[PDB]
Design a protein around this ligand. Structure first.
Ligand SMILES: CCCCCCCCCCCC(=O)OC[C@H](COP(=O)(O)OCC[N+](C)(C)C)OC(=O)CCCCCCCCCCC
Ligand SMILES: CCCCCCCCCCCC(=O)OC[C@H](COP(=O)(O)OCC[N+](C)(C)C)OC(=O)CCCCCCCCCCC
Ligand SMILES: CCCCCCCCCCCC(=O)OC[C@H](COP(=O)(O)OCC[N+](C)(C)C)OC(=O)CCCCCCCCCCC
Ligand SMILES: CCCCCCCCCCCC(=O)OC[C@H](COP(=O)(O)OCC[N+](C)(C)C)OC(=O)CCCCCCCCCCC
Ligand SMILES: CCCCCCCCCCCC(=O)OC[C@H](COP(=O)(O)OCC[N+](C)(C)C)OC(=O)CCCCCCCCCCC
Ligand SMILES: CCCCCCCCCCCC(=O)OC[C@H](COP(=O)(O)OCC[N+](C)(C)C)OC(=O)CCCCCCCCCCC
Ligand SMILES: CCCCCCCCCCCC(=O)OC[C@H](COP(=O)(O)OCC[N+](C)(C)C)OC(=O)CCCCCCCCCCC
Ligand SMILES: CCCCCCCCCCCC(=O)OC[C@H](COP(=O)(O)OCC[N+](C)(C)C)OC(=O)CCCCCCCCCCC
Ligand SMILES: CCCCCCCCCCCC
Ligand SMILES: CCCCCCCCCCCC
Ligand SMILES: CCCCCCCCCCCC
Ligand SMILES: CCCCCCCCCCCC
Ligand SMILES: CCCCCCCCCCCC
Ligand SMILES: CCCCCCCCCCCC
Ligand SMILES: O=C(O)CCCC(=O)O
Ligand SMILES: O=C(O)CCCC(=O)O
Ligand SMILES: O=C(O)CCCC(=O)O
Ligand SMILES: O=C(O)CCCC(=O)O
Ligand SMILES: O=C(O)CCCC(=O)O
Ligand SMILES: [Cl-]
Ligand SMILES: [Cl-]
Ligand SMILES: [Cl-]
Ligand SMILES: [Cl-]
Ligand SMILES: [Cl-]
Ligand SMILES: [Cl-]
Ligand SMILES: [Cl-]
Ligand SMILES: [Cl-]
Ligand SMILES: [Cl-]
Ligand SMILES: [Cl-]
Ligand SMILES: [Cl-]
Ligand code: NA
Ligand code: NA
Ligand code: NA
Ligand code: NA
Lengths: 311, 311, 311, 311, 311
């Protein structure tokens, strides 16, 4: 089998379309997602053209092996897609209508900077390598691009699934390549992070600040050091559900900053006890009284500063 | 091979049936389950019809490749089902009786709102895309729908396995699609959650309340802070066996509310010590005496309120 | 290819045999085990019969595709078995001797009630569906049923591998099915549970009881609360190695009961301190003195009661 | 295709050879390792013999399907090996030289008794089942047995890869089986266990013994209980990287014995406090003074005893 | 199919090229990485020569099965590569231009010594075994060696992807083997290690040193002991995170050294209390005063020494 011949010197336009059936397994650590969709391809092959009157039949159905099909591949997939051909239909003029159902694990980078208040643009890149006889260019048939109403991505809100209609045409290893960008716009469902990580984390911090209404060094040491260990447990829990980034994430910045608050609380608790032992509780009382205001005020201001920088 | 031709303008009715052999791996986090079943298909192909008298044989057995078989697919599967054809039998009138054994990982969403006292409706959606020549419509042969008596789903009680007999007929990419809903009704075995999470969690909370019968600030700080850490441990344990939901679960609500009880106990412990140091233990005693009643009463009432909202 | 014709109206007897080569991956959580074995099948096909004198050869070797082979399947397998045909031999009378080497992940339920002092009966169910022309019945050739001497199942003792010689003959979807039960009897190697879970757990419990020889409320609170947290660590460790059961397991009962001992010790520690503060240490001393005997005595008796109910 | 006929009544000698390319994934819990190697087979088939003068070529290359190849299998593999035929070469006398590249997950039991100062002998068992016409016996061609210089097994030192040249010839299901033992001798790289488990574990034990230079019961309770909890963390850590053995391992014995030291330290701490409260600190002092010497002396002696029994 | 015949006694030169499409899953524990690339092969087969005037085509396209293709394999891959042939083009002179898209899990050793400030040279080894008729030698076509601009390896910086143009020609099992070394130079993104492991770890070490400004033994015991439990909870981590090395990594040496600081602080805390109880706080004060300077000074110097030895 050979590719369709050009009437003039024009390339072959393969009209593409992806219709999402299932969206699942968005792995943040792996920066991958799994997809189950329909891939529709359409091109003109005049060699397959027929007179509908003389043939009786308006449409002709073919097996993949029987006709020439353009080698369309996905750029950002882990292993080559599992594909099952649904139908191949030839119209009288020779227009082929290919339809397959596929499943693929797509590699798409995520921006964790605003986590867990981040939004992502997942990509599915379609590509075709031009052949020796003629060049192949990709196109988007918007009527065959979409997603099923039941398509849900656990822990995410699906906003849109659109295609950048203009292909990226470039040269690779002395041959022309036509690439298409299918974009799935999603936003993270931050809800669960509030009662499970954010609020538990703040409670333990506020518990550490009760040491500013205590003169008992032994109890203060217990309060500040214990809550610090609960914070490490949370810090570890958070970094296990995320990949290692060469930048700070929003949660990462807050979590890190809270260590400084624990450290400074230890200094305060230490200073207050030292002064008390030195028989100067007057200075120790003023420092502790200031801390009561200073710690929540600086925490509240530092968080306004961080939220401003990240959002 | 081509589809059977219509006698009049009628579509082709493919009578379906799923008989469950094994049910396993209900993954809560993934919202998937694995199934091993029989898929039975039946349709009329008059081209395969034969006179039983002249043929001698009352039934004719065929290989899948030898005859036209409708392309029936599962909508909500991770990867395309692994299928092994058991038998294909043609009756004298041309009625084909197809039987295959399959295994599939089914994607079915879960309602975690009443966890671990939740019940679910798992779905298996069958679909067929109509061809060029004629439309294909799905049907349910109730005689061939069921499940084996030994079918067990670890940690779940299987109530029913029925089919919504009326197919969902719709249009997708200029063709007709006939969808069927097979529903597996299951209820969670909550038993283990009581001696492993619920009762241990309440014990540690009641241990924290013994600080209301203690004047020792250093001991109270130990009691309330230490038990709080065991609660953080149980909170993490519970959320590791669950996905992130944009809603509050029953266990989630209880676990969250218990943080407030720990926080308020820390305030009490702090208040009692402050007053005692300020040489006013009469106020400290009245607050501690009230707490002894207030904490269990408000906990018992708050739980009645929550159970009412959730059930 | 068609099945062998009956001389009279008799069904076809397929003599089976499973010879275990390797046993591995007994997953308690999953209630599965992996096997690697030989499957031997034998049936009479008179169409394949030959005169040994004129043929010279006493035996004739065939390729699977060349002759009719009964569709034998495993009921309780995750995915269809990986099978490699070793040999197919036809005797002069037409007796076929089939041999294949297979590997399968078998789903077999486990009874955790007596864990880790439990014994299991793993099952491998063989099945054959009767065909259009004639019925197929399964049989056991005890001479071809066994296991290799080196067959080891990590953390288990293999007692026996036998077959229930009488098949379960029943009707499913208007056809006869002949099922066979191959039983692998195994007992759990409890040894490791004693120095890793059982003894460490008792040590921490006995450490908590040293609070009955202490008047230091602050120290007692530390003793009882710290050891309680280690018990939570062990409970979690144990429940991670097991599936969630709708019944109490032996270890589960002991672990749960120990929480009650920790709770009552907290009550004692609280009571002793309250009385001491109320200036009545005479009552506090008598309660603490009684606890010294009561706690080990009630623990020893409660365990005798539990061991009696479980074994 | 049939096996080569015997000139006299002799069996067929298949000369084997395994040349390791890559060694990886030695899983201690699973008692498995992954291998990537060359399998070379050589036998005489006089039916394939040719005159080198008349033929023109001194060697003839064949496709697997074209000639008879002995069904050589691995005994101790999880799933049947992934094999890719590299070459099949026939010499003028009819000597066939088969070469394939394979990858397999090998099940080989491990002796954990001396962990992490243990050495293992990994096995790869080759087997051949004799056919109807003639018997097949395995042999070792030492010239084709080896391993690549770059072959590394992460966390292990590879000592040797040799073959037990004499095959284990036995009868199974009325047919002769010839088995070969390829042995990969390896020793564990214990280094990392010293700064990560052994030394951290000793430091915490020695920290617990500082309670013998303290009269503060409240501090001693903290010292001994805290370090006891950190010992439980190291115990749990160790047991996660190991399978459940029906015997005591070296690390297991030391870890277990250390619990006894923590228990006896709790008794001492308790005894010292009781006597001091009873207004007899003179005994309490003598018991504490003895403990300072007794604990390290008994620990040092007990360890000499254990190392002697284990090595 | 047979290999191309030599015009003179020359070997066959197969010009290779790897163009990386995707880089992912660099597993430090496993010392593996996953790759998705293009493999281009080119050789001369004069038997495939054709006249474009007669064939009516300037370049001929072939199916893999139709022509002789050299058996090129990857040395350091876990399982045989998933390959999909993109194109096979033969020009009139008989020069074949093969192109395939592949995905493989490559085994490449990592040098964790300077971790997490470590740089690595990942290798992809191409190999060809010479055949009976003629020798096959590998070559590098630099024009067809590269990587896509979007190629990202999570947590790593990709520096270069080059090929050692001179093949390693050697003899293995009486045949010539031609090996090629494709080198991917990468450097680890250490950023995340600083706010997640390094700084949290130093904070807890500095918190432990506040015991040098405290006379409260009970509080110092909590301080040094509790922070030690967290320097433990860290190191699991770095350990959870790495393979076991027969050498010391940079982070490993720092973590190990920190344990000595915690141990010596316990000695100090113990010494100070003993002297205080012995009614000699003047010695205790001088030791504690020195410790305040000695501990940070020795820590700062020890770290300069370590950083010097590692870098
Ligand atoms: C006036 C005291 C200020 C203390 C500031 C502490 C700075 C810590 C710098 C950390 C750098 C990252 C490092 C050890 C920190 C111990 C601090 C002990 C404070 C004792 C105060 C005594 C009462 C006068
Ligand atoms: C201290 C405790 C941590 C503070 C967390 C503050 C949340 C925040 O900063 O939330 C940020 C997000 C906004 O996200 P966005 O709309 O996608 O930004 C796009 C906007 N631009 C383009 C103009 C920059 O607000 C929300 O809607 C969630 C509010 C949740 C409140 C949680 C309180 C706990
Ligand atoms: C602290 C709070 C502990 C939780 C208490 C159980 C919650 C509950 O009462 O759960 C209730 C569920 C059953 O609910 P259902 O029949 O499925 O709902 C249908 C409700 N409609 C139709 C009215 C909407 O469990 C039970 O059978 C209760 C047994 C568990 C007792 C655990 C005691 C500890
Ligand atoms: C005479 C004291 C009896 C105490 C019985 C405690 C019953 C606990 C019931 C738990 C139900 C599950 C729930 C809070 C338990 C706090 C108990 C405090 C005891 C204080 C004693 C004061 C000394 C007179
Ligand atoms: C704290 C409680 C610790 C648990 C004590 C062991 C429970 C037990 O006694 O377990 C019993 C099982 C054996 O039972 P079986 O022979 O399989 O039962 C069959 C009984 N019929 C057929 C009559 C019904 O283990 C043993 O051999 C006991 C050795 C373990 C001792 C551990 C000491 C710590
Ligand atoms: C807690 C006590 C610390 C643990 C002591 C290590 C055990 C040991 O001494 O182990 C011994 C093994 C070597 O054993 P082998 O020579 O291979 O046995 C074969 C012997 N036969 C054939 C005679 C039976 O390690 C060593 O070379 C010791 C180095 C490790 C020192 C770690 C110090 C911490
Ligand atoms: C003068 C005090 C020197 C202390 C030397 C400690 C050596 C520790 C060696 C560890 C080897 C690894 C092993 C137990 C260590 C307990 C040390 C208790 C110190 C008590 C000081 C009393 C005040 C005079
Ligand atoms: C506790 C101690 C924490 C570790 C301190 C940093 C280690 C270091 O100095 O790391 C060094 C590496 C870079 O090394 P390189 O340039 O690739 O080596 C090549 C050098 N030759 C050729 C001379 C051998 O990182 C840096 O640029 C340092 C930035 C990290 C600072 C973290 C502060 C906390
Ligand atoms: C003191 C250190 C506590 C560490 C907490 C780790 C919990 C993380 C579990 C994450 C599972 C994915
Ligand atoms: C004193 C704090 C104990 C913390 C125990 C955390 C263990 C984490 C286990 C995570 C396994 C994936
Ligand atoms: C402060 C301690 C928090 C520790 C939480 C540990 C939970 C481990 C869950 C493992 C189950 C897979
Ligand atoms: C109160 C702290 C409980 C921590 C339990 C951790 C158990 C982790 C075991 C991991 C096994 C895979
Ligand atoms: C009381 C604290 C128990 C800590 C348990 C540590 C869990 C180890 C996880 C190992 C990762 C494979
Ligand atoms: C008491 C020390 C427990 C610390 C262990 C934390 C385990 C984290 C596991 C992370 C695994 C990916
Ligand atoms: O035929 C199919 O498998 C796709 C299912 C159609 C849809 O429900 O979106
Ligand atoms: O797999 C089969 O062929 C039938 C299984 C019958 C059953 O549920 O026991
Ligand atoms: O794998 C085989 O073909 C035979 C296994 C023989 C045995 O039990 O060792
Ligand atoms: O993969 C191959 O075909 C040869 C392996 C050669 C080697 O050990 O490097
Ligand atoms: O045709 C291909 O699949 C490779 C994609 C080219 C590239 O974008 O690097
Ligand atoms: Cl395609
Ligand atoms: Cl693809
Ligand atoms: Cl189908
Ligand atoms: Cl499907
Ligand atoms: Cl079969
Ligand atoms: Cl099966
Ligand atoms: Cl073979
Ligand atoms: Cl094998
Ligand atoms: Cl024999
Ligand atoms: Cl190749
Ligand atoms: Cl390869
Ligand atoms: Na084609
Ligand atoms: Na304390
Ligand atoms: Na057959
Ligand atoms: Na070829």
């Amino acid at each position: 089998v050979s590719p369709p011949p050009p009437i003039a010197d024009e390339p072959l336009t393969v009209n593409t379309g992806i219709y999402l059936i299932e969206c699942y397994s968005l792995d943040d650590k792996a920066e991958t997602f799994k997809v189950n969709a329909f891939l529709s391809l359409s091109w003109k092959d005049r060699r397959l053209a027929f007179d509908p009157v003389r043939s009786g039949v308006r449409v002709k159905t073919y097996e993949p092996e029987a006709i020439w099909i353009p080698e369309i591949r996905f750029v950002n997939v882990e292993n080559a897609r599992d594909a099952d051909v649904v139908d191949i239909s030839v119209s009288p003029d020779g227009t082929v209508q290919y339809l397959e159902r596929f499943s693929a694990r797509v590699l798409s980078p995520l921006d964790f900077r605003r986590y867990p208040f981040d939004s992502q643009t997942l990509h599915i890149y379609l590509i075709v390598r031009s052949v020796d006889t003629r060049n192949i260019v990709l196109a988007v048939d918007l009527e065959k691009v979409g997603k099923n109403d039941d398509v849900f991505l656990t822990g995410w809100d699906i906003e849109s699934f659109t295609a950048v209609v203009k292909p990226a045409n470039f040269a690779l290893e002395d041959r022309l390549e036509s690439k298409l960008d299918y974009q799935l716009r999603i936003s993270r469902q931050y809800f669960s992070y509030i009662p499970n990580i954010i609020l538990p984390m703040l409670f333990i911090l506020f518990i550490s600040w009760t040491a500013f209404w205590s003169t008992s060094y032994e109890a203060n040491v217990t309060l500040v050091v214990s809550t610090l260990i609960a914070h490490i447990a949370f810090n570890i829990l958070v970094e296990t559900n995320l990949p290692k980034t060469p930048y700070m994430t929003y949660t990462g910045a807050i979590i890190f900053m809270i260590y400084l608050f624990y450290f400074v609380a230890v200094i305060e608790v230490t200073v207050q006890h030292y002064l008390k032992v030195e028989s100067q509780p007057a200075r120790a009382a003023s420092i502790t009284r200031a801390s009561r205001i200073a710690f929540p005020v600086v925490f509240l201001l530092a968080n306004i500063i961080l939220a401003f920088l990240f959002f």
